[PDB]
Amino acid sequence: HHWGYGKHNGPEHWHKDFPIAKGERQSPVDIDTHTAKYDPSLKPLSVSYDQATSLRILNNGHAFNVEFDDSQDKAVLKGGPLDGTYRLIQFHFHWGSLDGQGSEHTVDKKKYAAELHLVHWNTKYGDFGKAVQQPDGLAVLGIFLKVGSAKPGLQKVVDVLDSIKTKGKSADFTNFDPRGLLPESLDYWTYPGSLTTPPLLECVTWIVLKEPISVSSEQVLKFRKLNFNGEGEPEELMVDNWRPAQPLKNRQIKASFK
Ligand SMILES: NS(=O)(=O)c1ccc(C(=O)NCc2cccc(O)c2)cc1
Ligand SMILES: NS(=O)(=O)c1ccc(C(=O)NCc2cccc(O)c2)cc1
Ligand SMILES: NS(=O)(=O)c1ccc(C(=O)NCc2cccc(O)c2)cc1
Ligand SMILES: [Zn+2]
């Protein structure tokens, strides 16, 4: 058996093999907008993706990842709460079975239809594997998705999903520009947290954008046609692959905006 999102392997079970699930800086969290505080110490945020090199898209049995070449500063995140340079390694989403759910973070308890995670690692640590042994190893840029108008820059992702229906399938995915997944504003909230899936490591500076992107109902419907299972196994739709909000504990959420 393995961890997942079902009744018998979902978030309530993870602590038995990953005891950090009950740790001091777990993610996601609810973002209480009234309690978050504007932080004048934050520097301007810099999302520098013009030289991004996407490579491949993979159904890993929990989500799909669009993977990037991270062997140079091609696509980086800097500024904001960050010290130094964080390189983009992959992005993926979490989404619901219904439009009223799917996000990991919540905003005043509001759940969005989905949430995009752009995953970066701190170059001072040399490789992702070493970065995940550090308290400041990772930075994840989180972006909420609501259902409304289509996101044109998402469509290339949607259209390849038929090639990667089942766990372990991959497809070449070159020349994808992740700038087409961003909203107009970079206003954000930030706090120290964790991976939201096993191994739940407490290595992440979370940067959660305030402005959601809209995607169409047809775009999310296609996410919901993916499968958690492998080819030839019983079909289990890849839906509700989100962890609920975790205790904030001894943390303060900071806002980039007044
Ligand atoms: N890694 S984990 O702690 O989340 C974990 C490990 C094993 C199990 C497990 O043995 N579950 C039984 C089971 C039964 C039917 C379907 C399943 O996916 C899992 C659940 C969670
Ligand atoms: N070589 S690469 O830059 O395209 C690249 C390598 C690994 C990853 C990645 O997502 N690594 C984390 C990971 C850990 C265990 C199993 C996985 O499939 C992925 C992404 C991009
Ligand atoms: N949902 S999330 O963005 O917090 C997230 C990002 C990356 C990963 C990830 O890379 N997982 C694979 C991994 C990481 C560290 C050690 C491992 O053995 C595997 C998991 C969750
Ligand atoms: Zn994620």
Query: What CATH number did the domain enclosing 130 receive?
Result: 3.10.200.10
181 neighbors 154 (Cβ within 8 angstroms): yes
**Stated resolution in angstroms:** 1.0
**Experimental method, per PDB record:** X-ray
Maximum pairwise Cα distance, the chain: 54
What domain count does the chain have?
Answer: 1
The structure tokens listed for 75 are: 């696509």
SS (H, E, C) the chain: CCCCCCCCCCCCCHHHCCHHHHCCCCCCCEECCCCCEECCCCCCEEEECCCCCEEEEEECCCCEEEEECCCCCCCEEEECCCCCCEEEEEEEEEECCCCCCCCCCEECCECCCEEEEEEEEEHHHCCHHHHCCCCCCEEEEEEEEEECCCCHHHHHHHHHHHHHCCCCCEEECCCCCHHHHCCCCCCEEEEEECCCCCCCCCCEEEEEECCCEEECHHHHHHHCCCECCCCCCCCCECCCCCCCCCCCCCCCCEECCC
φ/ψ of 158, rounded to 5, equals -50, -45
Domain of 131 in residue numbering reads as: 1-258
Q: Is 1 in the pocket of ligand 1 (CB under 6 A)?
A: yes
Q: For residue 165, count other CB atoms closer than 10 A to its CB.
A: 16
Distance 236 CA to ligand 2 centre (A): 24
> What is the C-alpha to C-alpha distance for residues 102 and 218, in angstroms, rounded to an integer?
16
> What is the C-alpha to C-alpha distance for residues 197 and 243, in angstroms, rounded to an integer?
8
The structure tokens listed for 250 are: 């001894």
Active site residue 1: no
**Which atom of ligand 2 is the closest one to the Cα of 56?**
4
**Which atom of ligand 2 is the closest one to the Cα of 68?**
4
Strands 170-172 and 138-147: unpaired
